Structures are given as structure tokens and as C-alpha cells.
């Protein structure tokens, strides 16, 4: 009566691939990476630059 | 010479205007029509009839006029800002 | 999700010489503007913080951290107190903004003196003058594929007479309703997750000083901007929805509100008013599919907001959300793994047919959902929605109840 | 000051550079801080608006709240009130020309709320209208510059607004006629190093700009003091004294 | 129920009640407020019958 | 009607293992939305009714 | 009868009564109220004469 089981829903358990069943999964796949966008600029038409 | 009974809370907001010791509230056309009708049969609008359909707004107007001596109340039929002295009589512009 | 239990990374650009630490403020925060004198005068010296009963002497600079729009550095233009009775963060921010409005506590930003800057971290025999450093954190979130299943278990004594007397099948009906119910339940689950995670709208920068802070009622003179009759009143809803779309843009940092999901009443109000910039108008609802029988998606708001209708609305509301062109910047992910794997069988004990459906989807939460926390917990965070990270915290969704319709 | 093992393993596992990421978030941070600094200098050195010649007699100085009938010229509902806001902007733009003598108001920088208000009004001369914010980029993700008002005012956005305001400014064709100068001297000079004890590399960025104030910005004095004045903004000479920028807090949006 | 204005009579639509006519005035704005009400229940049927 | 006393059938779609029962909720219903968690956690555990 | 606004004179139509002119303002709203009154009374002839 082999059971597939599942990770204990803990983030550490899924990250390590731990599974209460017989088979321990390789890893938690990949779904990309989210980086926070750089906030925008206001240009310099408001104030003269004059290098 | 009497004070208006308090109809619980939930009073409409009055915006304080320390620029001229005034304030501002948007009443509409029904409140002004009701006040004009009340001040035509010899009745009073500041405190009389504490169970009116829109007495809560009239009580708010009375409190606003007591707290601020130069209130600026805006109706909705014409959007005119009647002052405290103009609102004292209860007759706004026209009509019987 | 081709493979079960996917994961999503998230890079935090935080400063303070420690990529991971306690209370390290993120740099490129859409909510929190960067401390302008962090590389500047904030690196040469540490300014005294601004709090209750901090008598602001003339000419110096005080650091503060607002709950919204980040941290500020205020130059005291005149001596004044900060209303020592204000101890909570909200009241402290209110008092500081009051001082700002009066002009007593102005907001400035400057660089660093060249003498202090040219010698930093032990130069020319000096000491105790470190640089201001930065770094990236990179913490991950992990989701899990939850499952869902149903059974039919229809008798074989039934099908005979039911087909003989009604012409049905008793199998294409039960299987159809099972699959339809599973799909409907999954859809209702994701819709409730959108409403569950939606932030309380009309609270903060979208508030009018006199409004009710959470509901938009047409009977309030402040809420309708002193509107009259219906052409003027219903356009205040459009103005508020635009304000909350721009607030979503500020909080998320990805873009304006892309869609709204509303009740029948709010959608009907939207359709019955001229949404364009043209006087005040009203009439029968034409542009939007007000009913929820043909389809749910009911038109668009000037070609900007996709207006869906939530057919099971408790009291009333509209929820403005966000969904960028990419499938990643959504705010909540419904990632199916297996869809409706049908199973059949018949126990030899009774030979009565039995069938069932199984599916496994799992729901994930976009990192940077909170937009108010500069760092996650444990650096390996559960991606599934929960009390801690999803309830009333998704910056993407803002939900407002509309009253007085 | 990033580690070397961090670069070695992060390039292998994530595919980044571990140097262009840090250098990127350092140069971007410097530019963002400089931009916020010049914007804050503009706001802080801006004359308090709606005072003197632009003040309606029965109104507060420096505040334009939509709930004051005299403030909005006795407006009603929404279109009239926001059009009164537009009229106030025009009045301040002409006061800008009166004070500076260099030209009418040329740009405004406002909060998200004020820009959103401007985007939902028939800015031309025709009745009174409201609707969906159409003509302006109300949100600051794609860009901060949010359209133009009447083809005249380059309406920018102050995304990190504290409570609410709008500042009508000016900028002539010359970079000299500005009202305030962000005059860079060096621009993001990089610096590399490595402590020989541990060999872990350190990288940094150094800039030197300085901010100058335009003479005649006060424009209320026919002669300055000492014939040699400090050009950096300060409390004495750049606290609500520039005639090039006029700032008003808009309340009750 | 769903289509009721909170300050209304719950069963009638009289043009003399400003809450009922969305605070309208004269004739072009008061009658049009009925066109809203006739809409507010036309959708309501779609909620019930389906 | 050609013949008197006509009739019309109606097919409800109710869940709960019992097509007929005391208060068996109907699945497909315009007013009444489908229950949120019946095929999901509703089978793994039973939640307490709120009163 | 059926053409009587509950707040009118029942026999005359004066432009000065707000209920008679349905709350009209100035005269562009008021003469149109008179138009509505004559329209409403033209209908009742179809009710009575048939």
C-alpha cells in the first residue's frame, strides 16, 4: 500500500523536498523571480542643470 | 428660547473655516424648502418639530449657526451660499 | 504549474550594511520614498528622531518615518512642540503633517560636506565615520498544490427506468454537474481570495477628510463632492475609482488599477452615467451587461478598467485590482496542476457504478503583496494565502462598499 | 562591499552578476536621492501660494480647499470646483510672471490626488464636466511626467507627497533662468578596492553636485546683502522666498 | 431588499422624496431618476430567476 | 394545452450524497452561489455553523 | 382627479408653485412643466372619452 504522500505544507518542508510519503520530490520547481521595479525620475526641466 | 432636542448622533459633517470664522455644509433643496415652509405658518425651524423628516439637518444647521457666527450654507436648487443673517429669517430667496 | 509546488524568488534592495537584519528599510519601495539624505548628511551624522515632546530648535534637521510615503527629514523653521499627547504612529504622523501644513516643520534634503565625505572609514587618522552601504536580500516563497475531488455513486437500478421514462442518461448528467460544480467552486475560491486579500479601500490617501473611511455613500455631501441629482452624483464614483486606481499604482508600484469587480447595483450605476468628460448625464444602463446571465464581464470603463460582476455580493462593493501584461505581476496566482482526471469503477459487492473527479491546483501569493513590510519572515515563506500574509494585505486589490444606491 | 563566494555561487544558481546588481542599486539610489533632494529643494524654497495678489479676500493663504465656496468662487459639485482649481493655477502662473519677470508659470509638480483631479476635468473653456481620468498619466510607474495642462503647464507628479499640494514653477529656455540649479561637478564616479587581508571586493560611488539658488528669485529686494551671498539654499534666503515656484496645499480632495 | 435605497419607503417611488429621486430638481432630472429605478430592478430579476 | 391538467418537470442539482433530504442545498442556483469549500476542505473536515 | 399633482390647486396651474412646475427653476424649466401639464391632460381625455 505505497502512498504518494505530500509535503507537510511547511515552507521548509517543500523547499527541502521532504514528503510524508515514500517518494521525496527533487525540489519546489521554479516560477520566476519578482524584483521590485526602480522608481521613476522627474527629469530636470524643473531646474536648470548648468554642469 | 428653547434648545433643540438631540436626535442621537450621526450629525452631518460641518467643515470649519477659520478664514472668516465661518463654516460650510451642503444641505440641498429639500432642507431649504422645508425651512422656508416652516417659517411661513408662524412656526420655527431652529428647534420646533423635533420629529421632522429632515430635522437632523436642521439641528445641524442650528448648531453650525450657534458655533460659527458667519456660516455659509449652500443649497442645491441654486447652490447659493446663504449666510447666518440671511438664514435667520428662514426665507431664502423667493416663493411663499 | 507543470511540476508540483512551485517557488517564487523575491529580491529586496535594502540598505544599512546588512542584507538581512531587523528593521532594514527597503530602498526601491513604491510606498516608501528613499531617505534622500542617506548617502548625504545622513551618513556623516545621525539626526535626532522626531517624536512626542521633541522641542524643535530652529535650523536643525529631525528624522522621522511616516507610516506611508516613507521616511522624511524635516528642518524646523521655527521653534514648536509636537503635541506630546500624540504617542501612536498615526497621531504622530497627523501632528507632523499638521506642522508641515503650517510651515513650521519644513521638509528638506541635502548632500554631505566635502571635508567629511573625502575622508570616510578611517582616512587621515580619523575614526568612527563609516560609509552607508547597500545590498540585496533575495528571499523565496513556496506554494503547494492543494487538491479537490467529488464523487457521484449512481445506482444501476435507476438508469434503466430513468432512461426508459425520461430519456436521460443518469451518467452524462451526474458527470456534467460534478465537473461544472468543481469548476464553479474553484472559480468562486479564487474570487473569494481576491476579495479576502483585498485591502480596505478609501482608507489613507484615497480618503476625503470628512468621508466614512471604508464606504462610499451617495447621501454624504462630502463623498459626492457636493453633487446634485444623478448625473453629478454617479460621476463621484468614477472619480473615487480613479483615485483608488492611482492608489493601487502607488502601493504596488506596477501600474494603475487594471480591472474592477463589482456588484450588480454598482455596475448598473456605472453604466447609467456618462463616464466621459462631458457635462453631467444619466439614463438607462446601456454600455454594460448589467445582468449576470449572458456573461459576467460587463464592458470596460472608458477602455481602462475591465468591469466584472460578482454575482454573489453580500451587501455591495467594487474591488479595483491589478493585472499587468505579464502573468507574474498579478497579485494572486491560480496555478493548475491536473484538471479533472475522471475515474470510474464498480465494487463487485453490488456492481453499482461509481465515478469521481479529482483536480489539484494550489493557490499562490505574489511576493511584495503587503507593500508595507520591507522584509519577509524566515526567508522561506509559505506562498499560499493565510492570515499573516494575505488577509486585507494585498496591495493589488482595494475593496470599497458602496451605500445609498 | 560584496563577498567573493557570494558572487561565485549566485552567478551559478541565479544567473546574476552580484556586481551589476549592487552597482545598479547604488547608482540608482544616488540618482533617486539627488532627484528627491532637488524636488524637496523646489518645494521647500517655493513661495507660499495664494497670498497677496492671488488671495481671494475671504480665504486662507497657502491653502485651497474645495469645501470653501469663496475659495472655489462659489462653485457647485465637481466640475465647477476643479475648474476653479484650474483658474487658481492660472492666477498663480500669472503671479509667477509678475514676481519673476521671466515668464508665466511653465510647470507644476503635484501629488497623485491633484494630478488625478486635473486629469478628470474639461480643461478647456466649455461648461463643467467630470469623468474618468483620461488625459494625464495619473500613475507613476511608466513615467512621472503626466501630460500637459492646456499645452502650457508641464504637469509633473510628486510621487512621494506627504499630505497634498501643487507647486507651479517656471523654467525659461536658458538653463540660467530656472529659479534653482542642480549643477553637477562629478557624476557617479566609481571606486574599486579590495582589502588584502580577505580579498573580498568593495565597490563604491562618489558624486559632487552642489545646489545653487538663482539670484532675483526673491525679487522683493532691489539690492541684496553683502554683495557676496551664499548660493546654497538656506533658511535665510530660500524659505518660501523664490518667486519662481509658488506652492499651495490642496485640501479636501 | 437589494434594490432598496436605505432612506426610501421600500415599495413606492414618489418624486417628492429627494432620497428617492437621488436629490434631483425640476423635471429633466427627476423623471430621469425613475429611469435609474426601473433599471435597478430590471437587473434584479436577472439575479433571482437567473 | 390539448389535454387538460398539464404538467412540467424540474431538475434540481443538489449535493450531499442525498438527492432528497432535509434542507439539501442546491448547487446550480442564480441567487444562491455554490458553496465555497465542499469538494475541497469540506470533505476533509466539517466546520462549525455560525449562529 | 388622476391628472392632479397632490400639491396643486385642482383646477389651476400657476407657474409660481414649485410642485405645480415640479420644482422648476426660471422659465426654461417652467414652460416645459406647462408642456408636461397639457400633455398629461391630453392623455386623460383618452381615458375618459375613450
Numbering used by the authors:
A (entry chain A): 66 to 116
B (entry chain X): 281 to 376
C (entry chain B): 117 to 521
D (entry chain A): 269 to 521
E (entry chain C), G (entry chain D): 320 to 369
F (entry chain C): 117 to 167
Which text from the study accompanies this structure?
The atomic model consisting of the vertex-proximal gp23* hexamer and two C-terminal domains of Hoc corresponding to the preferred orientations was refined against the 3.3 Å-resolution cryo-EM reconstruction of the isometric T4 capsid (EMDB-8661) by adjusting the structure into the density using the Coot program, and refinement in the real space was carried out using the phenix.real_space_refine program. During refinement, the two Hoc C-terminal domains in the model were treated as two alternative orientations of the same domain contributing to the cryo-EM density. The refinement of the occupancies for the two Hoc orientations using the Phenix software resulted in occupancy values of 0.4 and 0.33 for the preferred orientations 1 and 2, respectively. Since the isometric capsid reconstruction is of a higher resolution and shows stronger density for the Hoc C-terminal domain, here we describe the Hoc-gp23* structure refined against the isometric map. The C-terminal domain of T4 Hoc contains a four-stranded β-sheet and a three-helix bundle on top of the β-sheet. The Hoc C-terminal domain, in both the preferred orientations, interacts with six gp23* subunits with an interface area of ~1200 Å2. In the preferred orientation 1, which shows the highest occupancy, Hoc interacts most extensively with the gp23* subunit A, which is the closest to the pentameric vertex. The residues Arg300 and His299 of the Hoc C-terminal domain, which are located in the loop between β-strands 1 and 2, are involved in charge interactions with the Asp336 of the gp23* subunit A, thus reinforcing the Hoc attachment to the capsid. The Hoc molecule in the alternative preferred orientation 2 is rotated by 180° around the capsomer axis with respect to Hoc in orientation 1. In this orientation, Hoc shows the most extensive interactions with the gp23* subunit D, which is related to subunit A by the 180° rotation.
The outer surface of the head is decorated with the highly antigenic outer capsid protein Hoc and the small outer capsid protein Soc. The 376-residue Hoc is a monomeric fiber consisting of a string of four domains connected by flexible short linkers, of which the three N-terminal domains have an immunoglobulin (Ig)-like fold. The Hoc subunits bind near the centers of gp23* capsomers, one per hexon, and have only a marginal effect on the capsid stability. Each T4-Hoc fiber attaches randomly to the center of gp23* hexameric capsomers in one of the six possible orientations, though at the vertex-proximal hexamers that deviate from 6-fold symmetry, Hoc binds in two preferred orientations related by 180° rotation.
